[PDB]
Amino acid sequence: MAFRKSNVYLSLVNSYIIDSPQPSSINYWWNMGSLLGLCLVIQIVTGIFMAMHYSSNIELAFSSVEHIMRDVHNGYILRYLHANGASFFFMVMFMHMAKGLYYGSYRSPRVTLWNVGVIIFILTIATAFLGYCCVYGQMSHWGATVITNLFSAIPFVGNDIVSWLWGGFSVSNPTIQRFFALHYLVPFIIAAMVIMHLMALHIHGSSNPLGITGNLDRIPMHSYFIFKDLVTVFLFMLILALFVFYSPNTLGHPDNYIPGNPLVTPASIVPEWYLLPFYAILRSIPDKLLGVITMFAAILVLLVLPFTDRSVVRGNTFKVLSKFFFFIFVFNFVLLGQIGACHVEVPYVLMGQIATFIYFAYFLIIVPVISTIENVLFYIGRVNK
Amino acid sequence: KSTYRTPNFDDVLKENNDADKGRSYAYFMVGAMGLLSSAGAK
Amino acid sequence: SLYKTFFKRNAVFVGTIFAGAFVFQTVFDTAITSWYENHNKGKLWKDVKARIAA
Amino acid sequence: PQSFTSIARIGDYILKSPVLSKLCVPVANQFINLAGYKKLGLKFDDLIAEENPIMQTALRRLPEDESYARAYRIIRAHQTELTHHLLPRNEWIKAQEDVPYLLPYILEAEAAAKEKDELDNIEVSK
Amino acid sequence: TGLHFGRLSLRSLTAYAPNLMLWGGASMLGLFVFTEGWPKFQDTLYKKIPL
Amino acid sequence: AEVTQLSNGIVVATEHNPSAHTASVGVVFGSGAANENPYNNGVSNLWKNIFLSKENSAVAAKEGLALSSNISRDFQSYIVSSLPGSTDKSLDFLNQSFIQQKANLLSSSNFEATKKSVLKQVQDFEENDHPNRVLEHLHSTAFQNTPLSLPTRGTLESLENLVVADLESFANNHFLNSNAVVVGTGNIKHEDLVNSIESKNLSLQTGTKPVLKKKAAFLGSEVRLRDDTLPKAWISLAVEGEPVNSPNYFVAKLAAQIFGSYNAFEPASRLQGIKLLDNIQEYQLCDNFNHFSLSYKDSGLWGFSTATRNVTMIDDLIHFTLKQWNRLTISVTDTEVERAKSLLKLQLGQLYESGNPVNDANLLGAEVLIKGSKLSLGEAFKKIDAITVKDVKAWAGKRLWDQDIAIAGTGQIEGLLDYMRIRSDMSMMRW
Ligand SMILES: CCCCCCCCCCC(=O)OC[C@H](COP(=O)(O)OC[C@H](O)COP(=O)(O)OC[C@@H](COC(=O)CC)OC(=O)CCC)OC(=O)CCCCCCCC
Ligand SMILES: CCCCCCCCCCCCCCCCCC(=O)OC[C@H](COP(=O)(O)OCCN)OC(=O)CCCCCCCCCCCCC
Ligand code: HEC
Ligand code: HEC
Ligand SMILES: COc1c(O)c(C)c(C/C=C(\C)CC/C=C(\C)CC/C=C(\C)CC/C=C(\C)CC/C=C(/C)CCC=C(C)C)c(O)c1OC
Ligand SMILES: CCCCCCCCCCCCCCC(=O)OCCCOP(=O)(O)OC[C@@H](O)COP(=O)(O)OCCCOC(C)=O
Ligand SMILES: CCCCCCCCCCCCCCC(=O)O[C@H](COC(=O)CCCCCCCCCCCC)COP(=O)(O)O
Ligand SMILES: CCCCCCCCCCCCCCCCCC(=O)O[C@H](COC(=O)CCCCCC)COP(=O)(O)OCCN
């Protein structure tokens, strides 16, 4: 046989990116996976070449970031690529998970793939939070303080857990040093989970935007989806180059260029832009413990998703009401982000509570009821009696 | 020599099998190793 | 059969392992601390604190 | 995960009632022709996901000619979705051709699996 | 002549449950091992004669 | 039905079936294959085939008498069948065959021809009958260096050393008075058989068969007869079972009956009420299996034999079978026990109450040799009805849960793993 098939190392390259049978009807929404892989490689390479100049002391963190942006040759390129690419990493990941919810890729036989995806999502949120605290600006310090006090809400144990996390009594030098070590560490766990994700994908192949089988008309990976992914790679690099070179500090928060001061609290403490729906979910609950439980349940309710989709056809392509309520859900998630960006004021508390309820009601009540009604409507539309 | 004539194991067999004695001694030793491994892992 | 019901279920087997490991940690810590202090009597700091009475 | 006996029971309860049928059969076929699976040249029994062993059984049950027709409708649907067009109006699946052809094979596999599970969990008449 | 099942039998559940209580007990013994040295649990953990 | 029994040194036990059309009359000795040293092994097979020799069968067939014989581990038998009007002829023939003379059966030509025939039959058994030679090696390695390990058929290396002196020495030490039961089954009355034995003399010998120095003891081991030039992989696997005269006899048989037998090619065999079939039918792990509860005088065996062509998934077959065996200790249900009760009533009534009188003669002779009287079938059905789920769980905890096993295999058994994973699979680690 061929050398790409008989060699031990090149057989994986073959069976994953050369001769992988892909369904020939998949559109550009089946390209966000390759795009996330490229953006992860961007994050790791800029992280290494920018962490060769970073000193993680609490008295030397912000000065070393400014040393990168001023004294290091092309260091502004590195930091701006790194932060804005983390923003694009979460945006492409949100689009990828929306592709997962829409076309029904979570359903059987792809439950393992969906669960490893949710694990990757949790690890990526953790990585972004740790790296945002490594800047040690104003928002970095106070966001670390608020999230660890949320961990202090745990009954009978929590204060000692938080003194363990801090490595002291408040967010201090051991906290920033261990956040830098963990933040260097967790992306390699993300890379291992990505390899496990690709294995759980490869044992059944991709889905298709129709929700029927794709075993009939398969076309290879090579040259077809290689050049289709190359198209979206160049578009992604174009938009990233715009938001790096022409308007770099748009997505960030301007308070992060104030150095970390434990005495001055800011006027409005807000995380970076993508953690705002989860921050709104947590802020909508009038309790600390129930708030933390609801914030983690807002990700575990993605795990309870394949067991509630009672639709007998895969994906929302050929269904009306499920497609409508899907876009209700997407614009609700955007409204959660925008509620979280605001203050704790009338009527944003009541709207945050209603928006959290519509989030959990979509994942727990709306999907099974609308899928059951859509099944019975498909049946009685064509069966006569 | 037939395949029904089992060769000599009599130098290495127990003189008394007593299938609770031997299994209890073996599980005692495996449990002692698990005991000290639990202490060391803690 | 007298001890084998004490080994039959794996639940009571690992429960015995964890109970014995708890007791072993406590007793072994106390015993090694006592022997290590007894072997070096006259050199530890509580001995010098007892001798220097001023 | 709807268990076709259940959807068949609900649909037959709707169809056998005159008021419910007169109320929600126009809603039903309005939902069908807004769904737009006809326009890709498909039938609804071509659209049920077939990656569970009971539906795989009901596809082994199927006669040969309907299996070749189903294979052609799937390949023309993939090609039409690939070109991002629709099939011309002469090639759309009409309302009379949208026959529930695979439903009885699916229902007999449902009854077989249900009976196997019940008999696998019986008591005894003491 | 039926049974209460969800692919797991009620007879099977009552057959395993007197062992599952022992599993919970052995897991609590495991936590009692791995959580000493933690001074918050030592308000409870030394009572009879480990002191 | 009724089984009577009387004594004069010999034991006369009958089953008057007045509906049958034949009548089997024969002597059932209490020696078997388990009463031989490993150097005269196969002498019982050779007595079977000199009794079934051509001259002896011809003299039998002159009067319309068909001969039959059987060599087991515990008991031999020598049964003569005839019409129900010829019981005197059958008794006088059996008298002339064993008692009155043995030198005409043990002539030079008859003995050499019979030794040639049994050497041919043992070689044909050794290289062509695979599941039975697997079961014989399973006995040869479960009970090794102990007289219950010897095969009933004999071995080629021992059987070509026998001469007439060993045949006569075995006859003088084992064809005795107290060792024997004369059995009449079929359409004969008990009083007719006793009066006809007392009409003749029919005194076999003085008595007292030699006593074995070593009792049977189970020994967990394995033997692997790997032959890559065979199309299948035959494998038996068993634990120490229950001997006869045990209170756990019917419980051991019902435990064997729970998992039953199976044939993958028969359609009505694939639909049985066994929970092992849901695991075993998916990837076609075996062609057949049967669970056996063998019971001997000193010990017994409980296990299963099987055959498979899926030689790369033998370990999955052993794995799912042994996890099903572990279900007996923990969580065997009531419906499986009721089903095994009904099926064991069925096969036990087929075994004891079939229409063939020679099988009734073999079974009655074995049972009244071992336990002095035959347990009739109604009390057997009451003992089967008395078994509960707790009895099966207690028996499985005593005999199955984490006990040594004995394994024998031949064919393409490379897919069969080591001894230790099969041994460690006897306990689940989850209970
Ligand atoms: C925000 C930062 C994200 C950074 C990620 C960078 C990549 C952005 C990815 C956006 C995306 O993937 O959307 C795909 C969406 C669905 O695609 P489809 O397969 O159904 O359409 C087949 C096409 O006609 C085939 O036509 P063809 O394949 O020959 O060329 C496609 C097109 C390439 O454009 C794109 O990839 C998306 C802009 O080439 C052009 O002619 C461009 C002309 C300037 O494309 C569409 O057709 C638009 C539909 C509405 C989507 C709106 C998105 C709002 C979120
Ligand atoms: C915690 C869990 C994470 C949850 C993530 C929440 C959502 C994150 C938001 C990411 C945006 C992703 C948008 C949804 C992506 C899937 C949409 C899609 O699949 O496009 C196809 C859809 C219908 O196309 P068909 O496949 O049905 O066509 C078959 C032809 N018969 O075509 C369409 O219907 C039009 C698609 C237009 C997309 C509009 C996107 C709006 C983005 C928000 C804008 C915010 C500003 C207001
Ligand atoms: C050393 C390896 C390294 C890796 C790998 C890495 N980063 Fe970072 N990241 C850093 C460093 C150093 C900083 C702090 C310097 C800075 O912010 O410019 C940082 C900062 C960040 C920031 C804050 C940027 C800012 O200035 O506000 C975000 C957000 C972030 N990382 C996200 C990610 C994500 C998401 C990934 C991958 C999934 C990732 N990082 C991988 C090194 C790394
Ligand atoms: C929470 C959901 C989810 C997250 C987050 C996620 N994945 Fe996926 N991924 C999926 C699902 C579902 C599929 C298959 C969907 C289908 O084919 O219908 C998939 C498919 C893929 C594919 C195959 C191409 C494709 O688009 O289907 C790649 C490559 C991939 N993922 C990589 C990644 C990488 C890299 C990350 C981030 C490190 C990631 N995924 C994060 C759920 C997820
Ligand atoms: C479903 O079909 C597939 C598919 O099967 C695959 C695999 C992919 C591809 C997906 C990926 C490749 C994502 C997987 C991503 C990873 C495994 C991340 C790997 C990245 C790293 C391990 C980090 C990179 C590390 C280096 C390059 C080391 C070198 C770096 C430095 C800094 C050394 C420099 C030092 C000196 C002194 C010069 C697809 O896109 C795809 O859809 C078409
Ligand atoms: C579109 C992007 C283009 C950019 C170009 C860069 C992209 C590079 C992508 C390379 C992807 C390779 C990583 C995939 C991977 O590691 O998976 C290995 C899993 C193999 O297991 P399997 O899939 O069951 O294969 C079949 C195996 O079971 C065969 O058994 P055995 O031979 O033992 O193999 C097991 C390998 C063990 O290694 C790992 C990591 O699992
Ligand atoms: C690990 C990082 C993952 C990132 C995801 C990237 C997915 C797309 C990868 C594109 C690889 C293109 C190789 C095609 C090829 O070799 O075809 C070769 C030859 O094709 C070419 O020469 C393409 C022209 C050169 C394009 C160079 C693109 C480099 C920019 C890459 C930017 C992203 C890293 C085989 O082509 P043929 O089989 O049709 O004859
Ligand atoms: C991030 C990876 C995580 C783990 C996933 C594993 C996938 C690895 C993908 C690597 C793809 C590129 C590897 C190309 C190497 C092919 C060359 C080759 O196989 O020739 C090999 C020899 O390889 C070597 O000597 C050096 C290999 C070092 C590779 C280090 C990268 C030829 O050996 P051959 O297959 O012909 O066997 C004949 C036996 N005498």
Short mmCIF file of N, CA and C in Angstrom, two decimals, chain A residues 23-28 107-110 208-217 219 228 306 309-314 317-321 323 371-372 374-385, chain D residues 1-4 7-8 10-12 14-16 24-25 27-29 31-32 34-37 40 42 44-51 70-72 74-75 77-79 81-82 84 98-101 103:
data_model
loop_
_atom_site.label_atom_id
_atom_site.label_comp_id
_atom_site.label_asym_id
_atom_site.label_seq_id
_atom_site.Cartn_x
_atom_site.Cartn_y
_atom_site.Cartn_z
N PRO A 23 -19.12 14.24 4.88
CA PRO A 23 -20.36 14.35 4.12
C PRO A 23 -20.27 15.52 3.16
N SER A 24 -20.74 15.30 1.95
CA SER A 24 -20.48 16.28 0.90
C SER A 24 -21.48 17.42 0.89
N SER A 25 -22.29 17.59 1.92
CA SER A 25 -23.28 18.66 1.92
C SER A 25 -23.05 19.66 3.04
N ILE A 26 -21.95 19.57 3.76
CA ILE A 26 -21.73 20.43 4.91
C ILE A 26 -21.28 21.81 4.45
N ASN A 27 -21.85 22.83 5.08
CA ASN A 27 -21.64 24.21 4.69
C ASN A 27 -20.49 24.79 5.52
N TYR A 28 -20.35 26.12 5.51
CA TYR A 28 -19.24 26.75 6.23
C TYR A 28 -19.38 26.72 7.74
N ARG A 107 -26.90 14.76 19.58
CA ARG A 107 -27.74 13.58 19.73
C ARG A 107 -26.91 12.31 19.52
N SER A 108 -27.54 11.18 19.79
CA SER A 108 -26.88 9.89 19.65
C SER A 108 -26.59 9.61 18.18
N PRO A 109 -25.44 9.02 17.86
CA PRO A 109 -24.37 8.45 18.68
C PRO A 109 -23.23 9.39 19.04
N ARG A 110 -23.49 10.67 19.25
CA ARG A 110 -22.42 11.62 19.49
C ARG A 110 -22.55 12.28 20.85
N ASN A 208 -24.38 16.31 9.09
CA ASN A 208 -24.63 17.07 7.88
C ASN A 208 -25.81 17.98 8.14
N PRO A 209 -25.96 19.08 7.39
CA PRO A 209 -27.06 20.01 7.68
C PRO A 209 -28.45 19.54 7.30
N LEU A 210 -28.62 18.29 6.90
CA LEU A 210 -29.95 17.78 6.65
C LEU A 210 -30.47 16.90 7.77
N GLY A 211 -29.60 16.29 8.56
CA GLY A 211 -30.05 15.40 9.61
C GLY A 211 -30.35 13.99 9.16
N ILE A 212 -29.88 13.61 7.98
CA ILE A 212 -30.00 12.25 7.48
C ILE A 212 -28.60 11.68 7.43
N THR A 213 -28.46 10.42 7.01
CA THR A 213 -27.13 9.84 6.99
C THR A 213 -26.30 10.44 5.87
N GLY A 214 -24.99 10.28 5.99
CA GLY A 214 -24.09 10.80 4.99
C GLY A 214 -23.18 9.71 4.50
N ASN A 215 -23.56 8.46 4.77
CA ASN A 215 -22.76 7.31 4.36
C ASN A 215 -22.83 7.04 2.87
N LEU A 216 -23.75 7.69 2.16
CA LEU A 216 -23.94 7.41 0.75
C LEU A 216 -22.99 8.21 -0.13
N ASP A 217 -22.89 9.51 0.09
CA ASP A 217 -22.09 10.39 -0.76
C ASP A 217 -21.05 11.06 0.12
N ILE A 219 -17.09 12.52 0.32
CA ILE A 219 -15.97 13.01 -0.46
C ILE A 219 -14.80 13.11 0.52
N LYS A 228 -11.51 24.56 1.49
CA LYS A 228 -12.61 25.28 2.11
C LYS A 228 -12.22 25.84 3.48
N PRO A 306 -28.88 16.11 25.36
CA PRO A 306 -29.30 15.01 24.47
C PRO A 306 -30.42 14.15 25.02
N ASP A 309 -34.03 16.31 24.03
CA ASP A 309 -34.41 16.51 22.64
C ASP A 309 -35.17 15.28 22.19
N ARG A 310 -36.50 15.33 22.26
CA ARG A 310 -37.32 14.20 21.89
C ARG A 310 -37.75 14.23 20.44
N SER A 311 -37.13 15.08 19.62
CA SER A 311 -37.45 15.11 18.20
C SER A 311 -36.84 13.90 17.52
N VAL A 312 -37.62 13.29 16.63
CA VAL A 312 -37.18 12.06 15.99
C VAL A 312 -36.36 12.34 14.74
N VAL A 313 -36.35 13.57 14.25
CA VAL A 313 -35.44 13.97 13.18
C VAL A 313 -34.29 14.75 13.77
N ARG A 314 -33.11 14.59 13.20
CA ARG A 314 -31.92 15.22 13.74
C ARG A 314 -31.80 16.64 13.22
N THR A 317 -33.18 21.85 11.03
CA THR A 317 -33.18 22.35 9.66
C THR A 317 -34.59 22.39 9.09
N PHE A 318 -35.33 21.29 9.24
CA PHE A 318 -36.63 21.14 8.61
C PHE A 318 -37.77 21.30 9.60
N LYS A 319 -37.53 21.98 10.72
CA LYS A 319 -38.55 22.19 11.73
C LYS A 319 -38.71 23.68 11.95
N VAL A 320 -39.96 24.13 12.07
CA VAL A 320 -40.23 25.57 12.12
C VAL A 320 -40.06 26.10 13.53
N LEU A 321 -40.83 25.55 14.47
CA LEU A 321 -40.91 26.09 15.81
C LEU A 321 -39.60 25.93 16.57
N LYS A 323 -36.66 26.01 15.19
CA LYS A 323 -35.74 27.00 14.64
C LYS A 323 -36.02 28.38 15.21
N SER A 371 -40.41 19.78 20.65
CA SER A 371 -40.03 18.62 19.84
C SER A 371 -41.15 17.58 19.79
N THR A 372 -41.86 17.38 20.91
CA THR A 372 -43.00 16.46 20.91
C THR A 372 -44.13 16.96 20.01
N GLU A 374 -43.82 19.04 17.48
CA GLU A 374 -43.36 18.94 16.10
C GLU A 374 -43.39 17.52 15.58
N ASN A 375 -43.11 16.52 16.42
CA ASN A 375 -43.23 15.14 15.98
C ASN A 375 -44.67 14.79 15.63
N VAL A 376 -45.61 15.12 16.51
CA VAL A 376 -47.01 14.80 16.25
C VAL A 376 -47.54 15.58 15.05
N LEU A 377 -47.05 16.80 14.84
CA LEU A 377 -47.47 17.59 13.69
C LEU A 377 -46.93 17.00 12.38
N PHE A 378 -45.68 16.52 12.37
CA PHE A 378 -45.16 15.81 11.20
C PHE A 378 -45.95 14.55 10.92
N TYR A 379 -46.39 13.85 11.96
CA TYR A 379 -47.13 12.61 11.74
C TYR A 379 -48.50 12.88 11.14
N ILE A 380 -49.29 13.74 11.79
CA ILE A 380 -50.66 13.93 11.33
C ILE A 380 -50.77 14.80 10.10
N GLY A 381 -49.68 15.45 9.68
CA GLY A 381 -49.72 16.18 8.43
C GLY A 381 -49.80 15.29 7.21
N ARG A 382 -49.20 14.11 7.27
CA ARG A 382 -49.13 13.24 6.11
C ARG A 382 -49.90 11.94 6.26
N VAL A 383 -50.24 11.52 7.48
CA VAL A 383 -51.01 10.30 7.68
C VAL A 383 -52.49 10.65 7.71
N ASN A 384 -53.27 9.99 6.86
CA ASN A 384 -54.71 10.21 6.78
C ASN A 384 -55.47 9.06 7.42
N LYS A 385 -56.50 9.41 8.19
CA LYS A 385 -57.38 8.44 8.81
C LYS A 385 -58.74 9.07 9.11
N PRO D 1 -35.87 9.62 19.98
CA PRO D 1 -36.37 9.22 21.29
C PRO D 1 -37.82 9.62 21.52
N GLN D 2 -38.69 9.30 20.56
CA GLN D 2 -40.11 9.54 20.72
C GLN D 2 -40.90 8.25 20.88
N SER D 3 -40.32 7.10 20.50
CA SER D 3 -40.94 5.78 20.61
C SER D 3 -42.24 5.71 19.83
N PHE D 4 -42.13 5.55 18.50
CA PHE D 4 -43.19 5.67 17.50
C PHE D 4 -44.59 5.15 17.83
N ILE D 7 -46.20 8.39 19.49
CA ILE D 7 -46.61 9.39 18.51
C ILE D 7 -47.74 8.86 17.64
N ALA D 8 -47.78 7.55 17.39
CA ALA D 8 -48.88 6.98 16.62
C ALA D 8 -50.16 6.99 17.43
N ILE D 10 -50.93 9.24 19.82
CA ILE D 10 -51.40 10.62 19.88
C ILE D 10 -51.99 11.05 18.55
N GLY D 11 -51.33 10.68 17.44
CA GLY D 11 -51.83 11.06 16.13
C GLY D 11 -53.14 10.39 15.78
N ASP D 12 -53.32 9.14 16.19
CA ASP D 12 -54.59 8.49 15.94
C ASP D 12 -55.69 9.04 16.84
N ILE D 14 -55.84 12.17 17.62
CA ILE D 14 -56.20 13.43 16.98
C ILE D 14 -57.04 13.18 15.73
N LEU D 15 -56.64 12.19 14.92
CA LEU D 15 -57.34 11.93 13.66
C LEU D 15 -58.73 11.36 13.87
N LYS D 16 -58.90 10.49 14.87
CA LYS D 16 -60.21 9.91 15.08
C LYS D 16 -61.20 10.88 15.71
N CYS D 24 -56.62 21.05 13.74
CA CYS D 24 -55.16 21.10 13.59
C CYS D 24 -54.60 20.21 12.49
N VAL D 25 -55.40 19.75 11.54
CA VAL D 25 -54.84 19.19 10.30
C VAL D 25 -54.47 20.29 9.29
N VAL D 27 -53.32 23.21 10.22
CA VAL D 27 -52.07 23.62 10.85
C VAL D 27 -50.98 22.60 10.55
N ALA D 28 -51.35 21.32 10.46
CA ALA D 28 -50.37 20.27 10.24
C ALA D 28 -49.76 20.34 8.85
N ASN D 29 -50.58 20.35 7.81
CA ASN D 29 -49.98 20.40 6.49
C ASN D 29 -49.44 21.78 6.13
N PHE D 31 -47.65 23.33 8.41
CA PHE D 31 -46.33 23.09 8.98
C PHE D 31 -45.47 22.25 8.04
N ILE D 32 -46.09 21.29 7.36
CA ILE D 32 -45.34 20.42 6.45
C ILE D 32 -44.80 21.21 5.27
N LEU D 34 -44.37 24.40 5.06
CA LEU D 34 -43.37 25.38 5.49
C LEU D 34 -42.07 24.73 5.92
N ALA D 35 -42.08 23.43 6.22
CA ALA D 35 -40.85 22.74 6.59
C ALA D 35 -39.90 22.66 5.41
N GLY D 36 -40.43 22.38 4.23
CA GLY D 36 -39.63 22.46 3.02
C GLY D 36 -38.70 21.31 2.79
N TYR D 37 -39.02 20.12 3.29
CA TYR D 37 -38.24 18.95 2.92
C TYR D 37 -38.68 18.39 1.59
N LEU D 40 -36.37 19.76 -1.41
CA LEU D 40 -35.12 19.06 -1.67
C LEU D 40 -35.35 17.70 -2.28
N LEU D 42 -37.36 15.06 -0.89
CA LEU D 42 -37.33 14.05 0.15
C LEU D 42 -38.74 13.74 0.61
N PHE D 44 -40.80 12.24 4.28
CA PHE D 44 -40.51 12.36 5.71
C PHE D 44 -39.94 11.07 6.28
N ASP D 45 -40.30 9.91 5.73
CA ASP D 45 -39.65 8.70 6.21
C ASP D 45 -38.22 8.57 5.73
N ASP D 46 -37.81 9.40 4.78
CA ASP D 46 -36.41 9.51 4.42
C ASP D 46 -35.65 10.39 5.40
N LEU D 47 -36.35 11.01 6.34
CA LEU D 47 -35.78 12.06 7.16
C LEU D 47 -35.56 11.64 8.60
N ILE D 48 -36.15 10.52 9.02
CA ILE D 48 -35.98 9.99 10.37
C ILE D 48 -34.55 9.53 10.54
N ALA D 49 -33.92 9.92 11.66
CA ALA D 49 -32.53 9.55 11.91
C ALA D 49 -32.41 8.06 12.17
N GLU D 50 -31.42 7.43 11.55
CA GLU D 50 -31.36 5.98 11.46
C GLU D 50 -30.12 5.40 12.12
N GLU D 51 -29.70 6.00 13.22
CA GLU D 51 -28.48 5.60 13.89
C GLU D 51 -28.79 5.09 15.29
N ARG D 70 -34.93 5.28 -1.97
CA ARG D 70 -34.52 6.08 -0.82
C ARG D 70 -33.07 6.52 -0.94
N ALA D 71 -32.22 5.64 -1.47
CA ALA D 71 -30.82 6.00 -1.67
C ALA D 71 -30.67 7.10 -2.71
N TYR D 72 -31.47 7.04 -3.78
CA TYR D 72 -31.41 8.10 -4.77
C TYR D 72 -31.93 9.42 -4.22
N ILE D 74 -31.78 10.45 -1.12
CA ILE D 74 -30.74 10.99 -0.25
C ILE D 74 -29.60 11.61 -1.05
N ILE D 75 -29.16 10.95 -2.12
CA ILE D 75 -28.03 11.50 -2.87
C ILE D 75 -28.43 12.76 -3.64
N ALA D 77 -30.65 14.84 -2.54
CA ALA D 77 -30.79 15.87 -1.52
C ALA D 77 -29.43 16.43 -1.12
N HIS D 78 -28.43 15.57 -0.98
CA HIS D 78 -27.08 16.04 -0.68
C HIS D 78 -26.52 16.89 -1.80
N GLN D 79 -26.78 16.51 -3.05
CA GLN D 79 -26.25 17.29 -4.16
C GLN D 79 -26.97 18.63 -4.29
N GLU D 81 -28.44 20.31 -1.79
CA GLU D 81 -28.00 21.14 -0.67
C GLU D 81 -26.56 21.61 -0.87
N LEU D 82 -25.75 20.82 -1.56
CA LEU D 82 -24.39 21.24 -1.87
C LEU D 82 -24.38 22.41 -2.84
N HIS D 84 -26.57 24.64 -3.07
CA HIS D 84 -27.33 25.70 -2.41
C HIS D 84 -28.52 26.16 -3.22
N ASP D 98 -45.97 11.68 -0.72
CA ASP D 98 -45.39 11.70 0.62
C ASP D 98 -46.11 10.66 1.48
N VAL D 99 -45.85 9.40 1.15
CA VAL D 99 -46.55 8.26 1.74
C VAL D 99 -45.75 7.79 2.95
N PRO D 100 -46.38 7.51 4.07
CA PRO D 100 -45.64 6.89 5.18
C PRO D 100 -45.27 5.45 4.88
N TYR D 101 -44.22 5.25 4.10
CA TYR D 101 -43.91 3.91 3.60
C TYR D 101 -43.12 3.08 4.60
N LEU D 103 -43.14 3.63 8.02
CA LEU D 103 -43.86 3.56 9.30
C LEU D 103 -44.29 2.17 9.76
#
